[PDB]
Design a binder for this molecule. Structure first.
Ligand SMILES: Nc1ncnc2c1ncn2[C@@H]1O[C@H](COP(=O)(O)OP(=O)(O)O)[C@@H](O)[C@H]1O
Ligand code: NI
Length: 368
């Protein structure tokens, strides 16, 4: 029993070439899901307003977590933030460094309350499909008459991303934005090029360069492929790796503003889950979660997750682990379904639906 349905649909005949034409590599890579459109998910307006409401509040609840964590060496330690980066992460929060985006993982089928599994607040995947590709899919399958006549979609990602980039340029001085990722990863997924086009629309000058193209200047500044100073850098590379990398002590004095900013390392951290539960006990959209090392109430079945990264249900031990009450994803046919609910800064911007056979695939949605 669900209050959303998975509706089979006839695939568009030229969607693979539409992807190729837009520079979208729809294949699975580095956690990016494989696009599918032999089906779509059908929601109601009520469900979407609910998702929006919950998404905006959960985001505010996450900012409260950061505020508390940043102010106690104890919590910065329980969050495994490397001590030699504490000043870098703290100053990033105390100077109010701006955020571009986040994606909440929400378990929900329309029944009961949506539950926060995790907040992908650093390098969330499936951006292109959610913002752009599934919107073209909607426009197309409407014109082909394969969707109900009043079909809409919970998706303002592109509009909000461009408006956020205008905000960054006009009020935070982001005139030139560098964009970067690891060579031989997701540069041809389409994410970097799509965000670059959004920044360009917002009249931001952009430059792409690979992680290994970044140079270390004489006074510690980071420099691009024209040996010029990098002031603002979008990265598709997680803080969990960067804060442990060889020249991470250079971060504090590099003179670079980052998207996502360093303080997002605290939100995009599984330790978020116990802190949310302690600060907001029995919140309707939270699950019981505790640090594994702590004396905590016993749970019938739960999930163990690392504080820096494989999830399992009850081999990992206690140290560096959180536990969270098990809450099964809704099953549609042979697959479990998960909602990915996007934020642009603090503004809910819509959802993408993902499926997997195991407790891999992205499906479009509509709402009526
Ligand atoms: N509390 C939970 N109850 C049931 N399933 C869960 C729970 N937490 C995570 N899962 C399952 O594990 C998968 C990965 O968990 P997640 O916290 O999203 O890790 P990752 O950061 O690797 O995506 C989720 O897609 C979901 O299928
Ligand atoms: Ni082509």
């Amino acid at each position: 029993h669900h209050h959303m349905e998975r509706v089979s649909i006839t695939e568009r005949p030229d969607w693979r070439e539409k992807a190729h034409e837009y520079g979208f590599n729809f294949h699975t890579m580095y956690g990016e899901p494989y696009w599918c459109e032999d089906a779509y998910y059908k929601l109601t307006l009520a469900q979407v307003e609910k998702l929006e409401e919950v998404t905006a509040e959960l985001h505010q609840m996450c900012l409260k977590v950061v505020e508390k964590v940043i102010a106690s060496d104890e919590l910065m330690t329980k969050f495994r933030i490397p001590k030699h980066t504490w000043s870098f992460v703290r100053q990033s929060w105390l100077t109010h460094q701006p955020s571009l985006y986040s994606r909440l993982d929400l378990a929900w089928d329309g029944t009961g309350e949506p539950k926060l599994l995790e907040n992908n607040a650093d390098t969330p995947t499936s951006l292109y499909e959610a913002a752009f590709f599934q919107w073209i899919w909607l426009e197309d399958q409407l014109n082909a008459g394969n969707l109900p006549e009043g079909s809409d979609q919970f998706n303002s990602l592109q509009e909000k991303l461009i408006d956020r980039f205008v905000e960054l340029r006009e009020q935070y001085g982001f005139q030139l934005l560098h964009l970067t990722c690891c060579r031989d990863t997701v540069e041809d997924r389409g994410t970097i090029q799509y965000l670059q086009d959004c920044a360009t629309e917002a009249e931001i000058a952009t430059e792409f360069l690979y992680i290994d193209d970044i140079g270390l200047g004489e006074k510690g500044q980071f420099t691009d492929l024209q040996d010029q100073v990098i002031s603002n850098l979008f990265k598709l590379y997680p803080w969990e790796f960067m804060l442990r990398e060889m020249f991470s002590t250079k971060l504090e004095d590099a003179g670079v503003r980052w998207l996502e900013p360093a303080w997002k390392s605290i939100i995009s951290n599984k330790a978020l889950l116990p802190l949310l539960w302690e600060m907001f006990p029995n919140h309707p959209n939270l699950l019981p979660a505790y640090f594994a090392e702590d004396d905590h109430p016993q749970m019938e079945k739960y999930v163990v997750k690392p504080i820096f990264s494989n999830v399992s249900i009850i081999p990992y031990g206690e140290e560096g682990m959180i536990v969270q009450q098990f809450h099964p994803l809704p099953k549609f046919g042979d697959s479990y379904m998960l909602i990915g609910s996007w934020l642009v800064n603090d503004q809910p911007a819509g959802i993408g639906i993902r499926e997997d056979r195991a407790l891999s695939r992205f499906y479009p949605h509509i709402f009526v």
